[PDB]
Amino acid sequence: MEDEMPKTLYVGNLSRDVTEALILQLFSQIGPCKNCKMIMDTAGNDPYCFVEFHEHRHAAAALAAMNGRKIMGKEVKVNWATTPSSQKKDTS
């Protein structure tokens, strides 16, 4: 059941004035970040960011430390984004 242990954090409730440099720094304060994608939405949706850690045990600390955190002028939400090692049935 290691598949249920994702190292990717699904942070939503972002804003265009919330710089990626700041977000990254916050997570680097918790654990070694591996990858980071701030989904700059074009259509007018809720912006979210995919932050991956090298260390799942560290990612757990980042969750509680950043989830519900007020940044700039919004309350962010850090959820567990399951990281598939293989087999994606989702078309996107």
- What CATH number did the domain enclosing 77 receive? 3.30.70.330
* Close Cβ partners of 16 (under 8 Å, ≥ 6 residues apart): 40, 47
- Per the CB < 8 A criterion, the answer to whether 15 and 48 are in contact is no
Q: Residue 33 is encoded by which pair of tokens?
A: 């970040």
DSSP code at position 15: -
Widest CA span of the chain, in angstroms?
38
Dist. CA 11–CA 78, nearest whole Å: 4
Dist. CA 86–CA 74, nearest whole Å: 34
Strands 48-53 and 8-12, how do they pair? antiparallel
At residue 47, the 3 state secondary structure works out as coil
Domain ranges, residue 30: 1-92
Mark 5-30 as b/e (b = at least 16 C-beta within 10 Å): ebbbbbbebbeeebeeeebeebbeeb
Tally of domains within the chain: 1
Dist. CA 48–CA 67, nearest whole Å: 13
